[PDB]
Design an enzyme around this catalytic site. Structure first.
Site, PDB file in Angstrom:
ATOM      1  NE  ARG C  13      -3.516  -0.480   2.863  1.00  0.00           N
ATOM      2  CZ  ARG C  13      -4.744  -0.069   2.539  1.00  0.00           C
ATOM      3  NH1 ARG C  13      -5.444  -0.680   1.587  1.00  0.00           N
ATOM      4  NH2 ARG C  13      -5.273   0.969   3.176  1.00  0.00           N
ATOM      5  CG  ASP C 142      -6.364  11.198   9.648  1.00  0.00           C
ATOM      6  OD1 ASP C 142      -6.937  11.779   8.712  1.00  0.00           O
ATOM      7  OD2 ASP C 142      -6.892  10.273  10.297  1.00  0.00           O
ATOM      8  CE1 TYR C 155      -5.217   6.037  12.343  1.00  0.00           C
ATOM      9  CE2 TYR C 155      -6.945   7.688  12.379  1.00  0.00           C
ATOM     10  CZ  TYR C 155      -5.847   7.106  11.768  1.00  0.00           C
ATOM     11  OH  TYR C 155      -5.377   7.565  10.558  1.00  0.00           O
TER      12      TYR C 155
HETATM   13  N1  LIG Z   1      -5.380   4.803   3.621  1.00  0.00           N
HETATM   14  C1  LIG Z   1      -5.815   6.047   3.824  1.00  0.00           C
HETATM   15  O1  LIG Z   1      -6.889   6.587   3.095  1.00  0.00           O
HETATM   16  C2  LIG Z   1      -5.154   6.928   4.856  1.00  0.00           C
HETATM   17  C3  LIG Z   1      -5.824   8.055   5.298  1.00  0.00           C
HETATM   18  C4  LIG Z   1      -5.239   8.890   6.258  1.00  0.00           C
HETATM   19  C5  LIG Z   1      -3.971   8.587   6.765  1.00  0.00           C
HETATM   20  N2  LIG Z   1      -3.310   7.462   6.322  1.00  0.00           N
HETATM   21  C6  LIG Z   1      -1.989   7.175   6.902  1.00  0.00           C
HETATM   22  O2  LIG Z   1      -1.019   6.886   5.913  1.00  0.00           O
HETATM   23  C7  LIG Z   1      -0.201   5.802   6.334  1.00  0.00           C
HETATM   24  C8  LIG Z   1      -0.279   4.628   5.356  1.00  0.00           C
HETATM   25  O3  LIG Z   1      -1.625   4.200   5.255  1.00  0.00           O
HETATM   26  P1  LIG Z   1      -2.016   2.734   4.805  1.00  0.00           P
HETATM   27  O4  LIG Z   1      -3.490   2.629   4.611  1.00  0.00           O
HETATM   28  O5  LIG Z   1      -1.062   2.300   3.762  1.00  0.00           O
HETATM   29  O6  LIG Z   1      -1.681   1.881   6.128  1.00  0.00           O
HETATM   30  P2  LIG Z   1      -2.042   0.405   6.608  1.00  0.00           P
HETATM   31  O7  LIG Z   1      -2.047  -0.454   5.406  1.00  0.00           O
HETATM   32  O8  LIG Z   1      -3.283   0.304   7.413  1.00  0.00           O
HETATM   33  O9  LIG Z   1      -0.772   0.092   7.537  1.00  0.00           O
HETATM   34  C9  LIG Z   1       0.532   0.131   6.988  1.00  0.00           C
HETATM   35  C10 LIG Z   1       1.391  -0.878   7.725  1.00  0.00           C
HETATM   36  O10 LIG Z   1       1.413  -0.584   9.108  1.00  0.00           O
HETATM   37  C11 LIG Z   1       2.006  -1.686   9.719  1.00  0.00           C
HETATM   38  N3  LIG Z   1       1.604  -1.965  11.112  1.00  0.00           N
HETATM   39  C12 LIG Z   1       0.349  -2.124  11.653  1.00  0.00           C
HETATM   40  N4  LIG Z   1       0.496  -2.481  12.959  1.00  0.00           N
HETATM   41  C13 LIG Z   1       1.818  -2.587  13.240  1.00  0.00           C
HETATM   42  C14 LIG Z   1       2.536  -2.927  14.390  1.00  0.00           C
HETATM   43  N5  LIG Z   1       1.943  -3.244  15.548  1.00  0.00           N
HETATM   44  N6  LIG Z   1       3.906  -2.940  14.320  1.00  0.00           N
HETATM   45  C15 LIG Z   1       4.583  -2.624  13.155  1.00  0.00           C
HETATM   46  N7  LIG Z   1       3.876  -2.284  12.013  1.00  0.00           N
HETATM   47  C16 LIG Z   1       2.518  -2.278  12.069  1.00  0.00           C
HETATM   48  C17 LIG Z   1       1.552  -2.921   8.908  1.00  0.00           C
HETATM   49  O11 LIG Z   1       2.665  -3.763   8.579  1.00  0.00           O
HETATM   50  P3  LIG Z   1       2.529  -5.327   8.181  1.00  0.00           P
HETATM   51  O12 LIG Z   1       1.512  -5.451   7.073  1.00  0.00           O
HETATM   52  O13 LIG Z   1       3.909  -5.772   7.691  1.00  0.00           O
HETATM   53  O14 LIG Z   1       2.155  -6.176   9.373  1.00  0.00           O
HETATM   54  C18 LIG Z   1       0.843  -2.289   7.707  1.00  0.00           C
HETATM   55  O15 LIG Z   1       1.143  -2.923   6.492  1.00  0.00           O
HETATM   56  C19 LIG Z   1      -0.650   5.406   7.740  1.00  0.00           C
HETATM   57  O16 LIG Z   1       0.167   6.072   8.664  1.00  0.00           O
HETATM   58  C20 LIG Z   1      -2.063   5.941   7.804  1.00  0.00           C
HETATM   59  O17 LIG Z   1      -2.511   6.233   9.117  1.00  0.00           O
HETATM   60  C21 LIG Z   1      -3.884   6.625   5.375  1.00  0.00           C
HETATM   61  C1  LIG Z   2     -12.144  10.779   8.859  1.00  0.00           C
HETATM   62  O1  LIG Z   2     -11.445  10.402   7.638  1.00  0.00           O
HETATM   63  C2  LIG Z   2     -10.489   9.404   7.689  1.00  0.00           C
HETATM   64  C3  LIG Z   2     -10.309   8.597   6.559  1.00  0.00           C
HETATM   65  C4  LIG Z   2      -9.357   7.580   6.521  1.00  0.00           C
HETATM   66  C5  LIG Z   2      -8.537   7.367   7.629  1.00  0.00           C
HETATM   67  C6  LIG Z   2      -7.580   6.347   7.690  1.00  0.00           C
HETATM   68  N1  LIG Z   2      -6.566   6.260   8.556  1.00  0.00           N
HETATM   69  C7  LIG Z   2      -5.877   5.131   8.362  1.00  0.00           C
HETATM   70  N2  LIG Z   2      -4.793   4.635   9.000  1.00  0.00           N
HETATM   71  C8  LIG Z   2      -4.243   3.456   8.643  1.00  0.00           C
HETATM   72  N3  LIG Z   2      -3.172   2.986   9.275  1.00  0.00           N
HETATM   73  N4  LIG Z   2      -4.795   2.709   7.591  1.00  0.00           N
HETATM   74  C9  LIG Z   2      -5.916   3.187   6.909  1.00  0.00           C
HETATM   75  O2  LIG Z   2      -6.377   2.503   5.987  1.00  0.00           O
HETATM   76  C10 LIG Z   2      -6.466   4.420   7.307  1.00  0.00           C
HETATM   77  C11 LIG Z   2      -7.547   5.197   6.896  1.00  0.00           C
HETATM   78  C12 LIG Z   2      -8.448   4.864   5.833  1.00  0.00           C
HETATM   79  N5  LIG Z   2      -9.163   4.607   4.987  1.00  0.00           N
HETATM   80  C13 LIG Z   2      -8.720   8.166   8.775  1.00  0.00           C
HETATM   81  C14 LIG Z   2      -9.676   9.190   8.811  1.00  0.00           C
END
Ligand SMILES: NC(=O)c1ccc[n+]([C@@H]2O[C@H](COP(=O)([O-])OP(=O)(O)OC[C@H]3O[C@@H](n4cnc5c(N)ncnc54)[C@H](OP(=O)(O)O)[C@@H]3O)[C@@H](O)[C@H]2O)c1
Ligand SMILES: COc1ccc(-c2[nH]c3nc(N)[nH]c(=O)c3c2C#N)cc1
Ligand SMILES: NC(=O)c1ccc[n+]([C@@H]2O[C@H](COP(=O)([O-])OP(=O)(O)OC[C@H]3O[C@@H](n4cnc5c(N)ncnc54)[C@H](OP(=O)(O)O)[C@@H]3O)[C@@H](O)[C@H]2O)c1
Ligand SMILES: NC(=O)c1ccc[n+]([C@@H]2O[C@H](COP(=O)([O-])OP(=O)(O)OC[C@H]3O[C@@H](n4cnc5c(N)ncnc54)[C@H](OP(=O)(O)O)[C@@H]3O)[C@@H](O)[C@H]2O)c1
Ligand SMILES: NC(=O)c1ccc[n+]([C@@H]2O[C@H](COP(=O)([O-])OP(=O)(O)OC[C@H]3O[C@@H](n4cnc5c(N)ncnc54)[C@H](OP(=O)(O)O)[C@@H]3O)[C@@H](O)[C@H]2O)c1
Ligand SMILES: COc1ccc(-c2[nH]c3nc(N)[nH]c(=O)c3c2C#N)cc1
Ligand SMILES: COc1ccc(-c2[nH]c3nc(N)[nH]c(=O)c3c2C#N)cc1
Ligand SMILES: COc1ccc(-c2[nH]c3nc(N)[nH]c(=O)c3c2C#N)cc1
Lengths: 248, 249, 249, 249
Positions: C13, C142, C155
């Site tokens: 991702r 975020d 979170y």
């Molecule tokens: N996706 C969104 O729309 C979104 C929105 C807002 C902010 N973000 C932020 O952007 C970043 C990337 O998002 P994402 O959706 O790609 O994240 P994600 O897939 O939910 O998490 C990324 C990685 O975090 C690692 N992780 C979870 N628990 C862990 C633990 N206890 N120890 C070590 N590693 C751990 C996992 O590694 P493993 O798979 O190897 O176990 C996972 O693959 C995050 O910081 C997230 O909060 C994302």
């Molecule tokens: C209120 O809007 C949001 C939308 C997405 C997220 C969000 N944060 C996440 N963090 C991790 N580690 N992985 C995720 O997939 C997301 C996620 C989403 N969607 C948080 C607030």
């Protein structure tokens, strides 16, 4: 075809460095100016020497008045007349001086500070949108919540500009027009300023105890207009060396 | 002797409830109004029936123009003329209407929306400070300023400018013992010309009670900021929004 | 010599996209992972296939515990062991699930949500700085932190803490020429457990294109912050949200 | 029946003043303490001398650990045991000390600083809400969260997490009629450990009076938020900082 950009107050300092870096990126540029004709023209000739027919100048006063909407419409119209398109608007021009609460009349200070910092950017945004990787970049201020003493009108204008950036980003997103800000902390200090007063500000900056170059400010504009920023809208990027993070 | 307060746009709705609560707290009040002459006079009547010589009206257009400084000076002057003092300024009056980026001229929309929401408050603040206990200013801001209504750029610009004024004026006037604060409604008394469907849409979004703030709930926060219980509060903006600004799209 | 970067949770991702883009920019990379061993080793294989000896994996749990500081120190040490330097740290790994106020114990949820999103970033930052040119740290934040999801308090507490670390570390490490910044997605890659319908509802709220950010779009902002084009930038959090944070309820 | 309030770290300083003012307003109070048994009982005696059986003390360590959730559940239970109800929770207890990036182990500092400032308030909030299904929670925040003290990363992380808890809990608890707000001092009572010269350096920075807030000025804001005058207010954080946060470097 090369894209085109309007940069207001582009004769000198930050606006100049913005116009230059945009030109170097491949933009044709409308160099707007108010009083600095000679510098605006010297910039245009320098850039046209680089690539012919890529730089024009546009004189306008951006003070608020009943002709400001027509002036702003004309600045956008100039870019279309020169280059047949207008992809980027940079709202850089700014009046900046104190207005204490306790020879210009107060209504004139309002006109200049609110006009340049807020109303002209709004009118230019309107004209820009009506005429349509399109984006607008507004030059904000990293220190808007920790303002200089006795700069209420300036600060009001910069706060208004934040509101414009957010409101326009929301409203123009369907047209695929992104709207963002760059917020310098301390960049190029006033030309009159003694080095010893320049140093009082420089010393406050955590990252290097120096002010940002105009080119460093321009780098952030360049990022915001680029294809690397195409999901970025309504964002204001501080370019302040951590200054805004420093308590009293 | 009783302190006095200026409340702009105080004939109707939130300004009126602010005027009334200030008056109930002991303030003599200047009831500024623009078009609402009958309502203004009726309120002064009401308040003066309760305590004689404690309320006057003052008419002014707060649209931006070259005479706006004079009008704002005259509002503050009318407080001194009636009550010999001016302790509290409340910047409540506000134009509110869409101005899309894509029958008034744009010049006029700029003058009204920026004039009422930002420039007049600045000039009133200036005149207030220059004519100078517990002195304070309260500005009516907007809790949704960073999550604005679509096509309200000029309105939102004025309310953003108002935040900047509140902060700048707090800093600059602190040496004079004048505090400057804000009260930021989310949804309170809804626009008269808003349809009942839109009204209910807004109400359903409010986490705390699924209803808009009463004018009196907004007024309560104004009363707090001007009181002796707020003597160390300056540069603060209190949301009174039932959590509306916390709710994502 | 080529610079080196640590990216946490880099197997899949957004983490993978940042790791890939950093590598395409010419960084050697430590792909940190927790459970996704196969995906992390697959990525390293691909990256090394492009340029020999430019990627290693590094397994670690980032849940808070009394040994978390040793674990984080080891991740930095791993970058120095592989590449003899560590120029960039990207704090991407994140636990993300609801914790309503009204099979994990609450203490485990605290350990995971606060540990991954805030404490591990803080411990990694300490280790990164202690071991020390264009040095920087980027924290995945975020955009919706002030408009949080219902029942995600821990979170959200964690992401808010991350904002404070971003700002605290930018201030304190500036003298060391270490810049500290964040990138704040709104919606980017939706959770794999999310059904298409819930995905589409989120997509439809985004003003800019009514779609989520690609992982690449998030990576683009990280790449800018670590670049020479951002040399004066520290303590800034760049939203990459398509206007989502600006949209009212 | 008279309402009841829990005030954490209520034995001394600001927590003591909050407890006194709540009691003076007509609340029965739980005075929580960790080390300050003597002072907590002294305050209890004084309050009970005023009205019999209206004050009780409650001992707990609010450091993060395996037993913290039980400790917090028991603080809330002590209020129900004493008074048959719990209307108000004030999260005041706080550890405050530097944790430079570049004595106690770092995990102990995480436990104390994030525990007292963020995790305990979260757990207390859970326990408070659960025992329900004019209720409100007030969290003691920090006006300078975005302009933090040098080398105070963990403390600042904890206070940022608390802002997150304030907003998340306001949103989630609104349907229960539970409001959640904050009070953010700038400089109030300076730390007893702080040198006198550094105390005066801070005082001179405050625009409004060049002095610190008394504890009672902080308490005044708590009193407003728990009152019927703040019935539409939730998720709001009121600065009580005399303009301090407005002052540039
Ligand atoms: N996706 C969104 O729309 C979104 C929105 C807002 C902010 N973000 C932020 O952007 C970043 C990337 O998002 P994402 O959706 O790609 O994240 P994600 O897939 O939910 O998490 C990324 C990685 O975090 C690692 N992780 C979870 N628990 C862990 C633990 N206890 N120890 C070590 N590693 C751990 C996992 O590694 P493993 O798979 O190897 O176990 C996972 O693959 C995050 O910081 C997230 O909060 C994302
Ligand atoms: C209120 O809007 C949001 C939308 C997405 C997220 C969000 N944060 C996440 N963090 C991790 N580690 N992985 C995720 O997939 C997301 C996620 C989403 N969607 C948080 C607030
Ligand atoms: N330099 C800094 O430390 C700093 C810090 C924070 C924010 N900023 C922001 O960044 C931007 C650039 O800063 P800067 O220092 O380069 O600006 P500046 O030199 O102070 O002004 C830029 C230009 O604005 C134009 N201008 C002034 N009044 C005008 C009017 N009535 N009508 C039309 N144009 C007018 C001038 O054009 P002419 O010369 O042609 O008359 C001037 O050269 C500004 O928006 C500023 O607010 C700068
Ligand atoms: N109602 C809400 O949900 C809400 C939400 C967020 C913020 N607010 C803020 O709270 C404040 C009070 O709200 P409200 O709904 O009571 O306001 P409102 O009814 O929309 O406006 C109050 C008064 O402002 C005066 N006004 C308008 N244009 C003027 C002008 N050009 N010159 C002088 N006065 C003018 C009018 O006075 P006359 O009638 O005498 O002509 C009007 O009665 C406003 O500042 C508003 O922005 C309200
Ligand atoms: N004073 C200020 O200038 C200022 C400025 C900004 C924010 N604030 C905030 O306002 C609130 C009150 O400040 P203050 O100066 O009165 O606070 P403080 O004296 O530093 O601490 C208040 C109480 O917290 C309790 N406490 C500390 N560690 C604990 C632990 N591990 N477990 C349980 N309780 C613990 C202590 O109780 P015992 O004595 O019983 O051990 C202490 O007396 C705090 O949340 C603070 O962060 C204060
Ligand atoms: C409170 O910190 C600051 C520092 C500098 C500035 C600043 N704003 C400016 N705007 C224009 N148009 N031209 C300038 O030179 C500046 C400037 C400076 N220095 C504003 C706030
Ligand atoms: C984006 O959310 C909102 C909702 C309401 C308002 C609002 N502002 C107003 N200003 C005046 N003068 N009069 C009003 O009725 C409103 C109003 C509303 N509703 C602003 C932003
Ligand atoms: C950057 O300005 C400040 C000023 C005061 C404080 C502050 N925080 C505290 N927390 C506890 N628990 N106890 C305290 O005395 C303080 C304190 C101070 N002074 C923090 C940041």
């Amino acid at each position: 075809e090369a894209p085109a950009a309007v940069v207001t107050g582009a004769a000198k300092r930050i606006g100049r460095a913005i116009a230059v870096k945009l030109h170097q990126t491949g933009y044709r540029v409308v160099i707007h100016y108010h009083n600095s004709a000679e510098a605006a023209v010297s910039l245009a000739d320098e850039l046209n020497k680089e690539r012919s027919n890529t730089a024009v100048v546009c004189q306008a006063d951006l003070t608020n008045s009943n002709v400001l909407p027509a002036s702003c419409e004309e600045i956008i119209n100039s870019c279309f007349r020169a280059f047949g398109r207008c992809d980027v608007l940079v709202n850089n021009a700014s009046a900046f001086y104190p207005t204490p609460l306790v020879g210009k009349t107060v209504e004139t200070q309002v006109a200049e500070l609110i006009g340049t910092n807020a109303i002209a950017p709004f009118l230019l945004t309107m004209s820009f949108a009506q005429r349509q990787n399109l984006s607008i970049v507004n030059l904000c201020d990293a220190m808007v919540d920790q303002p200089c003493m006795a700069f209420s009108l300036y600060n009001m204008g910069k706060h208004a500009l934040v509101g414009l950036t957010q409101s326009a980003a929301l409203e123009l997103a369907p047209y695929g027009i992104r709207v963002n800000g760059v917020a310098p902390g301390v960049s190029l200090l006033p030309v009159a300023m003694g080095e010893e007063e320049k140093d009082k500000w420089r010393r406050k900056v955590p990252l290097g105890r120096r002010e940002a170059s105009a080119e460093q400010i321009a780098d952030a504009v360049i990022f915001l207009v680029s294809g690397s920023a195409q999901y970025i809208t309504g964002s204001i990027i501080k370019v302040d060396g951590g200054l805004s993070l420093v308590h009293a």
